[PDB]
Amino acid sequence: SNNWDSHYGFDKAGEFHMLDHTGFAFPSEVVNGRRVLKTTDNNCWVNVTCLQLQFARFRFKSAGLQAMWESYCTGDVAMFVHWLYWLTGVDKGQPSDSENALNMLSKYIVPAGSVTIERVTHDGCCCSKRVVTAPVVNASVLKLGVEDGLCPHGLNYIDKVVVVKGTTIVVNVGKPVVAPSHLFLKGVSYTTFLDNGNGVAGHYTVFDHDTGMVHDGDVFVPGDLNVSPVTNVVVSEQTAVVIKDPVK
The terminus-to-terminus CA distance of the chain in angstroms comes to 25
Question: Is 7 annotated to bind ligand?
Answer: no
- The alpha carbon of residue 132 and the mean position of all alpha carbons in its chain are separated, in whole angstroms, by 16
Size of the site for Zn ion (CB under 5 A): 5
* Residues of span 30-89 touching Zn ion by CB under 5 A: none
Helices (H), the chain: 5-8, 13-17, 44-55, 63-73, 78-88, 98-105
Has 153 been labeled as part of a binding site?
yes
Residues 6 or more apart from 70 whose CB is under 8 A from it? none
Residue from 1, 33, 153, 182 binding Zn ion (CB under 5 A): 153
Pick between residue 153 and residue 182 the one whose CB is nearest to Zn ion: 153
Looking at 104, 151, 179, 201, which residue binds Zn ion (CB under 5 A)?
Answer: 151
Q: Which stretch binds Zn ion (CB under 5 A): 82-90, 108-116, 118-126, 191-199?
A: 118-126
Q: Which whole-number Å values give the CA distances from 113 to 137, 163, 237, in the listed order? A: 10, 10, 9
Single residue of 19, 30, 110, 125 touching Zn ion by CB under 5 A: 125
Q: Which residues are annotated as a binding site?
A: 125-126, 151, 153
Residues that bind Zn ion (CB under 5 A): 121, 125-126, 151, 153
